[PDB]
Write an enzyme that holds these catalytic residues in place. Structure first.
Site, mmCIF file in Angstrom:
data_model
loop_
_atom_site.group_PDB
_atom_site.id
_atom_site.type_symbol
_atom_site.label_atom_id
_atom_site.label_comp_id
_atom_site.label_asym_id
_atom_site.label_seq_id
_atom_site.Cartn_x
_atom_site.Cartn_y
_atom_site.Cartn_z
ATOM 1 N N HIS A 274 27.944 -51.465 -7.893
ATOM 2 C CA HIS A 274 26.637 -51.308 -7.263
ATOM 3 C C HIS A 274 25.472 -51.286 -8.243
ATOM 4 C CE1 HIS A 274 28.535 -47.230 -7.609
ATOM 5 N NE2 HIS A 274 27.414 -47.014 -8.277
ATOM 6 N N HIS B 263 20.753 -47.643 -16.103
ATOM 7 C CA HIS B 263 21.027 -48.702 -15.142
ATOM 8 C C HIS B 263 19.733 -48.998 -14.408
ATOM 9 C CE1 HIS B 263 21.485 -44.927 -12.910
ATOM 10 N NE2 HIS B 263 20.856 -45.595 -11.957
ATOM 11 N N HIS C 86 17.957 -50.306 -10.402
ATOM 12 C CA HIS C 86 17.983 -50.615 -8.975
ATOM 13 C C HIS C 86 16.969 -51.723 -8.747
ATOM 14 C CE1 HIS C 86 20.114 -46.789 -8.087
ATOM 15 N NE2 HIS C 86 19.424 -46.374 -9.137
ATOM 16 N N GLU D 140 13.286 -47.350 -6.103
ATOM 17 C CA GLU D 140 13.725 -46.249 -5.221
ATOM 18 C C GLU D 140 12.499 -45.358 -4.987
ATOM 19 O OE1 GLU D 140 17.630 -44.861 -7.052
ATOM 20 O OE2 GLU D 140 18.191 -45.885 -5.211
ATOM 21 N N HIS E 15 16.662 -46.241 -14.571
ATOM 22 C CA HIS E 15 17.061 -44.845 -14.656
ATOM 23 C C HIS E 15 17.813 -44.619 -15.958
ATOM 24 C CE1 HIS E 15 16.863 -44.314 -9.970
ATOM 25 N NE2 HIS E 15 15.675 -44.300 -10.545
ATOM 26 N N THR F 10 20.552 -40.444 -6.355
ATOM 27 C CA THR F 10 20.167 -41.329 -5.259
ATOM 28 C C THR F 10 21.327 -42.136 -4.704
ATOM 29 O OG1 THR F 10 19.613 -43.171 -6.693
ATOM 30 C CG2 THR F 10 17.858 -41.559 -6.220
ATOM 31 N N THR F 11 22.527 -41.989 -5.255
ATOM 32 C CA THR F 11 23.718 -42.556 -4.648
ATOM 33 C C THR F 11 24.688 -41.424 -4.355
ATOM 34 O OG1 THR F 11 25.057 -42.889 -6.638
ATOM 35 C CG2 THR F 11 23.425 -44.615 -6.086
HETATM 36 C C1 LIG Z 1 28.459 -40.747 -11.144
HETATM 37 O O1 LIG Z 1 27.481 -41.400 -11.909
HETATM 38 C C2 LIG Z 1 26.226 -41.496 -11.279
HETATM 39 C C3 LIG Z 1 26.000 -40.820 -10.091
HETATM 40 C C4 LIG Z 1 24.764 -40.916 -9.471
HETATM 41 C C5 LIG Z 1 23.745 -41.672 -10.031
HETATM 42 C C6 LIG Z 1 22.402 -41.732 -9.299
HETATM 43 O O2 LIG Z 1 22.379 -41.392 -7.963
HETATM 44 C C7 LIG Z 1 21.075 -42.165 -9.937
HETATM 45 O O3 LIG Z 1 21.178 -43.525 -10.226
HETATM 46 O O4 LIG Z 1 20.032 -41.972 -9.026
HETATM 47 C C8 LIG Z 1 20.660 -41.325 -11.147
HETATM 48 F F1 LIG Z 1 21.575 -41.337 -12.155
HETATM 49 F F2 LIG Z 1 19.460 -41.787 -11.600
HETATM 50 F F3 LIG Z 1 20.483 -40.049 -10.720
HETATM 51 C C9 LIG Z 1 23.974 -42.361 -11.213
HETATM 52 C C10 LIG Z 1 25.211 -42.262 -11.838
HETATM 53 ZN ZN LIG Z 2 19.799 -44.847 -10.479
#
Ligand SMILES: COc1ccc(C(=O)C(O)(O)C(F)(F)F)cc1
Ligand SMILES: [Zn+2]
Length: 257
Positions: free
Chosen positions: A61, A91, A93, A103, A116, A195-196
């Site tokens: 994703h 990473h 989005h 986001e 992010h 956010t995931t």
């Molecule tokens: C398990 O590893 C991750 C879990 C959640 C995220 C996110 O939901 C996110 O991309 O929003 C952030 F990291 F910015 F918080 C990223 C990596």
């Molecule tokens: Zn993110």
């Protein structure tokens, strides 16, 4: 499982992850006239001089550029933060079109993408323990707009061919994340969540006011990636963003007036 499609996207996540309807969910719309200037916020301290990138991964994703977080090599400090946060990965989005993809939004404006840079609080020993804490993560969010190319992004762009599908990884050493930062470190900050899924409410969000510019060519190469694994039907990795969530009982603070 969960994703960004018609039948498993953000509006479905609450069924497996009830915290999706919680009290400090991300992202949010940043209303620039309601955010409060706080002169007691310190400047951000971004110390990436000793950063050690290791690999780049298509996780189905996004693509994550992962760093060595076993020492204080690349840390975030200052701003609203107490203590030290280590960079584990960054990473992005992004959208199927230039007018969507971020986001967070700024007075309802959507950017073409959002970077992010994910950091975890050294007090918790590792990332997995940190995400279980209200102050476990600090995420530096940077908006991308389409215009001039960003030179420091191109190395990322050029390796995406080698990680087209879910589960693919590639060595990715000696990448300097300082090449992804805007000039100014002016920021908004608020308490929020991943956010995931699992959407844990563990993040201090630090969102930079100043976007970076990337070229249409650079963002187009993001959109050639795939959510699916090799030998599976091709579904382009686009619109991997969660929409703005209700602010509820939270106050967005600004480091600048
Ligand atoms: C398990 O590893 C991750 C879990 C959640 C995220 C996110 O939901 C996110 O991309 O929003 C952030 F990291 F910015 F918080 C990223 C990596
Ligand atoms: Zn993110």
């Amino acid at each position: 499982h969960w994703g960004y499609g018609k039948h498993n996207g953000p509006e479905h996540w609450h069924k497996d992850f009830p915290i999706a309807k919680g009290e400090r969910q991300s992202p949010v719309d940043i209303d620039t006239h309601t955010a409060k200037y706080d002169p007691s916020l310190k400047p951000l301290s971004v110390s990436y001089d000793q950063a050690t990138s290791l690999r780049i991964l298509n996780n189905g994703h996004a693509f994550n550029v992962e760093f060595d977080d076993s020492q204080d090599k690349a840390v975030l400090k200052g701003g609203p933060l107490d203590g030290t946060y280590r960079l584990i990965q960054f990473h992005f989005h992004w959208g199927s079109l230039d007018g969507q993809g971020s986001e967070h939004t700024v007075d309802k404006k959507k950017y073409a993408a959002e970077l992010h840079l994910v950091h975890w609080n050294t007090k918790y020993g590792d990332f997995g323990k940190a995400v279980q804490q209200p102050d476990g993560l600090a995420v530096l969010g940077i908006f991308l707009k389409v215009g001039s190319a960003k030179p420091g992004l191109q190395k990322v762009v050029d390796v995406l061919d080698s990680i087209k599908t879910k589960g693919k990884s590639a060595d990715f050493t000696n990448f300097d994340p300082r090449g992804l930062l805007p000039e100014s470190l002016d920021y908004w900050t608020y308490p929020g969540s991943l956010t995931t899924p699992p959407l844990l409410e563990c993040v201090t969000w630090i969102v930079l006011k100043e976007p970076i510019s990337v070229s249409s060519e650079q963002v187009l190469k993001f959109r050639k990636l795939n959510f699916n694994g090799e030998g599976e039907p091709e579904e382009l990795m686009v619109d991997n963003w969660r929409p703005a969530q209700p602010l509820k009982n939270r106050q967005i603070k600004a480091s600048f007036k």
